[PDB]
Structures are given as C-alpha cells and as structure tokens.
Design a protein around this ligand. Structure first.
Ligand SMILES: [Ca+2]
Ligand SMILES: [Ca+2]
Ligand SMILES: [Ca+2]
Ligand SMILES: [Ca+2]
Ligand SMILES: [Ca+2]
Ligand SMILES: [Ca+2]
Ligand SMILES: [Ca+2]
Ligand SMILES: [Ca+2]
Ligand SMILES: [Ca+2]
Ligand SMILES: [Ca+2]
Lengths: 636, 636
C-alpha cells in the first residue's frame, strides 16, 4: 500500500501513474489558489477517492486519497478534477490525468507450494502464521557428468534443475504505449548478490554474483514473466540467510533528466537450513566400506534399506564411514532433498562424499580448513542430534544438535572446529548443545550415548553407557557362583579374565568411577537441555579403561555405539562371560531393549574395529527420512 | 540450581561436595540392596532433604533431593544416612558425607550499578525487566602520553582506567583444607577470548586474546576476589556482542586421574553499542576548522557550548569537519563516555580524530578499508539520526539511523561502504534506514533534510528542502510587483538574476521538478519508517540545479543544511531578493521557524563553502548529550 504524493495545480494539468494495490495521496493545499475558501472533487468512475477529516473546507489537515479499480487501457484514461471555490469567486479547476497499471511480483510466501501475489510485506516471519518464501542452495549435480555443484555455473544445463529452483513471476497489465516511457528493473543488494542467482524463463541469467541489477524487456498490455531463483550459500555467521529481490518501476519519459522511480516492490526469500536426522526417524539407505558386511546386510534387509559399499582402492585403508560425513537434508514446499555434510578431517574417505554420494538429487556441503589444523572432535562420530523434544515449554520439533567438547579450554583440550560450530548454530532449527566428550580418547559423543525408538512416553529412550550397571551385573553374577566366568573367551589371541579378578581390581574401579563422573555430568546436561526425566533414560552396562593421558577407552566392545535401523539393532558383540550358554551382557542388554519392541543383534567388529578403537556404528552410516514437520513452521 | 547426581551404596560411605544455591540429587535405588522393600532418610540438621512422590517405599520413580543451609566449617561436617529395610530383615545403612561450600560469581546483572550474586541465569535479556551485565570497549586513551587505545596493551597503566571496566567478584566460603583437593578455573570460549580482557585486582591479567583459561589461587574459608573486565570489540557482523565468563570447580583429589568438574557457573556480558545523538538533544561542545568563526562563535556562546578549532597546518586544506567524523557515545550503568566514529574517507582531517579529539574519556572507533576503494556517501555528511520516535506501536527511544543511498544498484550508482552499514546494523539500538541521496552531486542526506526541536507534538520538526515552496515564494513576490528583484545581490563576483527571469526559466523548472520527485520519494520513505504525519514536516524553500551527470546542487546556499545548537540556528545565509530591506528568503524561513521558539541566524559561507559545494552544517560538528533512556531497556 506504499504510495506516492501527487501535487496538483490550477495553473496546469498533471499526469501521474498509479499502481494497483497502492494507496495514492493528493496535495490540494500547497498549490491552492488564493481567495478560495473551499474545494470539491470529481473523478471518472474508475477512480475511487476517499477523503477524510458533498463539499469540503480547505485545510492542510484534511486528507485526500486515491485508489483505482482497474488497469488503464489507455494513457490518462482516468481523470480527477479539483474545483477550488469561494464566496465571491467562480470555481477554478485543476486537472489530473491518471494511468493505472498492474505491477505485481509474486513468489510462494504462504509456503504452500503455489505462487501468490504480494499481507505485511517486506518481512520474513516464522511459524504456521508467518510469511515469506523459501530458497534452496544448489548443492547437487544433476548434470550427468560434472564434478561440480550446480551453482558454480551461472547457466542452467538441465530441465530437472528448475525443480530445485523457486519460481517467481512478474504480472503486468498496462496500456500498450506504456513501456515507451517507463522501464522495469529487477535488483538485489550488492551485499546479497553473491548469495543468489536468478534466471529468466522463456533460460538466461539476470541477477547473480556479478550483476546486482537488470532491465526487464516487457510489452505493453497483459504480460507474465517467469523467473527461477537458486541460492548459492547456506546461512552462516556472515549470512543470516535472507535474500530480498526488488522490482522498480522507472520513469524515463524525460531525456534530459535521469530515471525517476515511481514504484518499488519486493519479496523476501529465506535460504533453507541444513537439517540432521535422529535415529528415531525411519531409515532409507545404508552405508559401509566379510564377517561384518553380511551381518549388517541381513540387518539392513530386515529394516528394508538399500546398501552401498566403498572398495579398498578408494577407501585407501580408511574403514570409518561415520566420521567423514553426515547425511542431512534441505527442505522447501516445492522440493525436499538430501544433502551431505562433508567433514574437514579428510583421511581415507575424503573423495567419497564429493564423488559417490553426491549426484542427482543429492546435495553437498562442507566447512573447515581442509588444509590441516584439525582435531578428532572434528569427525562426525562427534556430531549427533536428539529426537524431537520439548524443553520447559519450548518446542524442538526437529530435535537438538549434540556435539562433544571439553569442560574448559586448555592447552591439552580439544574442540570441534569453530567453523563447524558456527555453521550448526546458523541453521537455528535445531539449537546445538555442547556435551563433555573430551575425556574419551577418541572423544566422540556416540561413544557414551545413543537414542532409540520407543512405543510409549516421548517415543524414544536415551541410552547411556553405565560402568556401574556392568559392575553390578558382574557382582550379581559372582554372587550366584559364576565368579569364575571368563571374559574375552572365544578369542584366538587375547588375555581372558574372570569376573572375580576384574571385580577385585581397584585400578579399574577408580577408572570407571571417574568415567562414571564424566558420563554423569553429561547425563545432567542432557536432562536439562533435552528436558528428560529418568524414565526416559536407560543405562547400558559398559566398562572403560583410561590409558593414554588418562583418556578413556572401551574395556570391551562398546555396545551403546550401535547401528539403529528402525527397531532392528546393530549392537556390537561383547564377548562376555558365558552363562547357560548365553553371554550375560547380551542377555542384560536384550532384557533392557526388547521390552521396547526392539530386536537386538550382535555383530563381531572385534579384530576389525574394537581393537582399532572403534565399533559398528562407527564403520557405518545411514540416510534417514526427513521430518514431516516443516522447519519454517518452527519459531526458534 | 544446576546440580549433581550422588549415587550412594550400603557397601561403603560416599564423600561429595555441595555448592550452596545448587539443587543436589540422590540415587537410592541403583545401589539398593536386595531383600529390602523400603527405605528411610536421616540427616544432620544443616542438610534439608525434600523427597517427593515418616517412611517410604523403594521405587526408581520416587525422587530425593538435598539442599544445604550453610557452608561447612569442616570437610564432611554434614552427613546423610539412608536406612534400607524390609519385612524380615534388619536395617542396612548407607553413609554419605557432605562438604557444603559457597561459590558465587557476581556482576551487575540488574544493570543498577551494583554487583549482585548470580534469576534465570546464563542468558542476556533486553528491557526494563530483563537481565545481564553491560561491558564497554576501551576506545580511549587515559594514558597521558600514548598514541593507542587502552585495549591493545594487555596491562592496566592507570587508576582511572578501572572506571571504564566492569567489576566482577568471586565470593567463596569453604573449609580451610578445601583447596588442597579442589581448584577453581576461570575461562572464556576460545571464540570470545580475542574480544575480552580480564584483570585480577589485589593488576594482573587472567583472561585475554591469548589465554582462554586461568587457575585461581584461593585460600580456604571466607574469601572475596575482584576482577575487572573490558571489551576489545564492538558488536559487528561476526560478533553479536555477547561475552560469557565461566567459573569451574575442579576436583583434583586424585593424582592418578584427571580433574573432575563438580560445578560451573557463568555471567553473560553484553558489549555496549555505539550510539548517535540527534539534533534534538542539547549540545555540549562545538567543532570547526574569519567572517565565519565569529558568527558560529557568538552562536555557540548563546547556546552555552565550548569550542575547538583545527589550524590549517593540520587540516592541510580540508575544511569539512562534518564529513570525517561523528561523535556518538557508549553507555553502561557505571560509566558513560563519548566515542568518535572516524570515517574511512581520509582526506585532510584524518589525523584529527585519532589525535585531538581522542583522549581521556573520549573513545575512538573506525570501519572501512582506509586504503582506498571509497565513495562520497562514505563521509558522515551522509550519516544522521532521527529523534526518538514511535512507528506503528514500535518504540525507537534512541532514534533511527538515516543514511543515503541509490534506489537500485548500477555501474554509476554510489553507496556507503558495506562495512559501515553492517557496523550500524550490528548496534541494533537505532535501526538504520536507507534514503535516496544518490541524486545529489555530493549525495548527503543533510543536503535535503534536517531535524529541529519543537515545543509541541512529538517535540521536533522534520525540515525538508522544498523547491516548490521557493517557486511559490518568488511567484507571490512577483505578483506584488517585486519581480524585478535581484538574486545574488551584494556579491562582488556573481551573475545576478531577477525573480521574473528564473520564474520564466523552464530548464530550471524541469530540474526542480525532478529534484522535487526525489525529495518526495524520501518524504514518503521517512513518513513510513519514522511514523510521521504532515504536521511533523516543514518545507524550507530551496532551489537546485542538475549539473554534472544531471547531479543536483544547491542553486543558492542550502539552508536546510544548518547548524542546530539547542534553539539557536546556524542557517546559511541565502543572498535573496531584498524587499523592504529584508531578504525574502530569510523572512520566509523565520516565519516558519520562530513560531517554534527557534532563533534564526544567517552565516555567510558563500565564497568559502557554498561555491565549494558545501555549507555551514558541513564545515562544522557538534558533540551532544547522551539520551537519558538506557539502551538496554529497549527491546529491539
Ligand atoms: Ca544451475
Ligand atoms: Ca540442481
Ligand atoms: Ca572431506
Ligand atoms: Ca535436483
Ligand atoms: Ca553422526
Ligand atoms: Ca587497559
Ligand atoms: Ca580507559
Ligand atoms: Ca579517518
Ligand atoms: Ca576513561
Ligand atoms: Ca553527521
């Protein structure tokens, strides 16, 4: 409804343009003739004049406003006439000729999947009742053979490409001669131009990193013009994630003067954030790079998932697929696609994300130096997310990002690279949470925690490693006369130990006391930030040993670090004291999990992983299904 | 109230620490003995146990919480005892020894000027009902002879220095032997450490750009410890402006293990923004660099202001003091001081801000390349601020920043450097607004606008240049027979012109029509963003001419560009057609302004400024008085 001031004079007629949807304002008094007390307005049928605070007295305070019903077929085909009169003097008329035109920029600001006419404009608001359009980055390659993301081009090399792009239309209705005297320009702020590209559909580029503005070629009369917009960047520290595109109507009718802006209108796009998927979400495809693969294969099957493997020659000795990448997604009403976050750690798998996984309808993103200057907390073993959760009346429908850290900064402390942290914060939809993982030798949060699907309560359980739980398990076991039982039996090479020997070992006990302290610190942490009760947590019996720098490791294969496919569990096989032909550990675990409807399967990673200081969940990766909840409907 | 989990066992006693202010939690069930149905709690007088959902049944769902009345005088001088009993079995007791200590980090989070004990913690909230501490950057030099700001040092070289700094105290109450087994550390995130420095008062540095953490040396018993914090950076694109300082309590009682964090607490500081002062605020000192100086001197006097001049040798030919700098301020409950924003334009005056103005209790800041790559919109002729204003129910108590720009980006368009814009946005307290000034040759907003104090309404008027107002003035003048009157009479060299000659000049008329369009675009702009009505605006008759690139200039000395000292006006003298021994222009102006209580004085800048394409307001600068309204009480 942003209008213009039109100043009219008795001396001469005035010619003005009026955009439909706009509220036009009239100045009578400035130019009003002397000796006239009062005034009157008369106008062609298509012009509706509302005049506030019949005849009227002449006062600078009275207000006259013009609105128009429809676009003009001809220049000046509507007119207003102002009669200035007074007691002894005959009426003196001022003439005004109006050309009404329809200029509307439309995008999908109702987030319904359908383009709508421009409502409180010029702002992007969160929630179900909010407004403003969504934009996706082009992180994939739909170009059958190309090694780069779609957005380094400046050109559209595919039909499917348009599907990721957001549609913006310009609707004009004008007299025919109109654009002889007027010219439309479409622009972005120089500050936002490197973050967006726009294409004209007949596809030719209009706006982009080198081009803040462009002149539209438009015919008089009724015309419609399609544009396709793509974002070149994710929200980040330097980029809040909003892009504004503006249409200006310029008056060129004077050659000796410069262009004169009559009218401006805009749309605001918000770049869609990168989102992680919790284990609570249903799986889609599975990732790993002979004993092992068949177990995880039957598993993946029972869970109805595809599978992909990376042969050595590509891997180049690197068996951890959990650490190099994280499969998230980006989402817009029109389009939803998976995007791979690629970790800066760069060891054996670095090419894998940029090559095999990235492709048609699979996006890619990365952060961090990649040159060096990196930590162990930089691998995605250390990046996780909770299931949807409500904390103290604040709703986190997409979950909450969890990543590991130290308690305070020191020389010997480790942390995730600042760039990653910042990246995660900039998405805003799942507020990241810092946990204390630096006590662990490797230092990953998945080492002490996991989440599982639950039929009741909040629909999930938090699993935490519990040395206490294990000590107690073994104690009860001894009490029943099994204290002679051998741990690590069934192993070609290993040093087997009896329950009574470990239970009587005081060093081990100090170690697991300390570990217990650490895991507990995190337990209270998670309770506060996830709003969890004790009924939401389950302790997995697990043992640890502090070794190098008193850094903690799994005493036996770490079970809480496990592959969760739906309700089918990819638990690492502890080789526990066998009792009644049954490992007491497996039995305890199942007695815990099965009541939830989960099935527990135990895979042997032992000489392949556990002795390499890793486990099942680590040598593996999963793509899951995007939340039904629309991120824009959140209000962070 | 963030606590710890204490797990107790019948097998052996447990020793734990409890911080006062913290809510401690007890786990009975995990370690509970078999054959016991129920349990009972008994505790020394100083320990209050609240146990929810007398005796009690043993269930994992029942919840037991410990709070302590006062700090322990001795290690373990409070104790809890849990009795596990059942029907056929005698009570079995578990012992727990508590040492209670007082650890509190205090800063001024009520923003009252007094340090308070740590309330919803760990967050900084806006408004009168919000919370969290304020921090000032050290932008000045209190070091009598030093060329640098106080914050490049790392050391405290003055007593007065502490006055800018914010006080944070640590209050401890502990048993004496306590710190034999425990150690306090104070830290900042590595991400925030370059933005803060902290000093220990006995002054020694503790935290800073190279040092994220430090070990506190604290005696047992009752002790108090002063720290003094200073910010090294203003809020900016990369720095939202929050600094968090944390205190951790580490348990070192085990040599073979690492430190174990018992307790953490924090304060959040918010770095104070840089704020501009509108002309509506009462003046303090005046700035300029022979006809002129005496006029502005009598003026400054009548307005009760100090004065300072810059001699040529320093100026080096540069007479514009308005363009190189802007005097704002930073504000904290404990301290409020002026800070100079120094423009990147860097011509003749560049040294002046970093030397003469910067000093004791005068801060300094700068943005932009300073190497080159600069515009004319980068001078502070182009930076202004409105008076306090309310727009559509949104309160802007500190005003709204206004700066000039183009309508859309082109090759030939100019803009203020992005770094400046970003800087201004990052302060948030006065939301900057973009106006269209690029039509002007110089392109400054002060060229077409000014603000003045008003006794009524909103307490100010917006003054806009009005070519229409001037044309009408001359027309009425001609009608009364003065059309022969000479403009520019009284000038040694100049081409004088009669009212009838300019009124009959059609080129001039087109030019001022276009200019009128531009100023009007801005008029509606300002009406929307400042929530102004027409009764708030006053049009100053002013004429223009488009010359180079059809860029606009003042036809005669530009009056709206004027020195406002309280109600005493520093208007540039137009040399107008003299009528009744009185310039019609001056007379019109006064007839407009005097009713408001303002006095109008007309200074001759003509051969010194106006012919250099500048005026009075431009060759001059003013320091005004900071708003009474506290910026933190705003809610942007
Ligand atoms: Ca493309
Ligand atoms: Ca694509
Ligand atoms: Ca990589
Ligand atoms: Ca695609
Ligand atoms: Ca992960
Ligand atoms: Ca200092
Ligand atoms: Ca100082
Ligand atoms: Ca400078
Ligand atoms: Ca000072
Ligand atoms: Ca200024």
């Amino acid at each position: 409804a942003q209008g213009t001031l039109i100043r009219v004079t008795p001396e001469q007629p005035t010619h003005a343009v009026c955009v439909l949807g706009t509220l036009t304002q009239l100045d009578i008094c400035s130019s009003a003739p002397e000796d006239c007390t009062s005034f009157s307005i008369n106008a062609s049928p298509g012009v509706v004049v509302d005049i506030a605070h019949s005849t009227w007295p002449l006062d600078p305070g009275v207000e006259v406003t013009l609105t128009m019903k429809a676009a003009s077929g001809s220049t000046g085909d509507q007119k207003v006439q102002i009669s200035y009169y007074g007691p002894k003097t005959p009426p003196v008329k001022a003439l005004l000729y109006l050309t009404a035109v329809e200029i509307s920029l439309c995008a999908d600001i109702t987030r319904t999947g359908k383009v709508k006419p421009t409502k409180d404009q010029r702002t992007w608001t969160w929630g179900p009742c909010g407004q403003g359009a969504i934009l996706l980055v082009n992180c994939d390659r739909d170009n059958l053979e190309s090694s780069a993301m779609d957005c380094e081009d400046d050109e559209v090399l595919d039909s499917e490409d348009l599907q990721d792009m957001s549609l913006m239309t310009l609707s004009t209705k004008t007299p025919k001669d109109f654009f002889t005297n007027h010219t439309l320009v479409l622009h972005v702020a120089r500050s936002e131009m490197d973050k967006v590209r726009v294409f004209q559909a007949t596809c030719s580029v209009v706006l982009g990193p080198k081009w803040p503005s462009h002149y539209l070629m438009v015919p008089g009369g009724k015309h419609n013009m399609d544009f396709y917009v793509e974002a070149l960047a994710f929200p980040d520290t330097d980029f809040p994630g909003l892009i504004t595109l503006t249409i200006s109507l310029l008056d060129t009718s004077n050659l000796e003067l410069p262009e004169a802006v009559v009218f401006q209108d805009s749309v605001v796009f918000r770049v869609a954030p990168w989102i992680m998927t919790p284990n609570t979400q249903p799986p889609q495809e599975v990732y790993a790079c002979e004993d092992f693969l068949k177990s995880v294969t039957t598993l993946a099957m029972k869970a109805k998932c595809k599978l992909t493997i990376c042969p050595e020659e590509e891997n180049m000795d690197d068996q951890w697929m959990q650490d190099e990448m994280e499969i998230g997604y980006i989402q817009a009403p029109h389009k939803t696609l998976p995007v791979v976050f690629d970790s800066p750690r760069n060891r054996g798998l670095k090419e894998f994300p940029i090559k095999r996984v990235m492709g048609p309808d699979f996006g890619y993103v990365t952060r961090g130096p990649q040159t060096g200057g990196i930590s162990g907390l930089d691998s995605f073993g250390n990046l996780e997310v909770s299931p949807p959760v409500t904390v103290r009346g604040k709703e986190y429908p997409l979950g909450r990002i969890l990543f590991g850290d130290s308690c305070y900064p020191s020389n010997d402390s480790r942390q995730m690279h600042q760039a990653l942290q910042d990246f995660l914060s900039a998405q805003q939809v799942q507020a990241p949470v810092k946990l204390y993982s630096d006590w662990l030798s490797v230092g990953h949060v998945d080492e002490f925690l996991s989440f599982v699907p639950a039929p009741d309560r909040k629909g999930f359980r938090l699993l935490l490693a519990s040395p206490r739980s294990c000590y107690k398990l073994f104690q009860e076991q001894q009490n029943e006369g099994h204290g002679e039982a051998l741990l690590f039996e069934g192993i070609k090479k290993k040093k087997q130990q009896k329950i009574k020997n470990i239970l009587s070992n005081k060093t081990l006990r100090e170690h697991n006391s300390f570990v217990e302290r650490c895991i507990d610190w995190n337990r209270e942490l998670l309770k506060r930030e996830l709003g969890l009760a004790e009924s939401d947590i389950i302790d997995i019996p697990q043992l640890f040993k502090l070794k190098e720098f008193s850094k903690a490791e799994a005493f036996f294969p770490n079970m809480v670090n496990m592959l969760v496919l739906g309700k089918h569990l990819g638990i690492p096989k502890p080789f526990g004291p066998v009792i009644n032909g049954r490992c007491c550990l497996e039995e305890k675990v199942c007695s815990l999990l099965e009541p939830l409807g989960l099935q527990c399967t135990f895979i042997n990673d032992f000489f392949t992983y556990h002795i390499r200081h890793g486990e099942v969940h680590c040598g593996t990766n999963v793509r899951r299904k995007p939340f039904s909840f629309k991120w824009w409907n959140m209000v962070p």
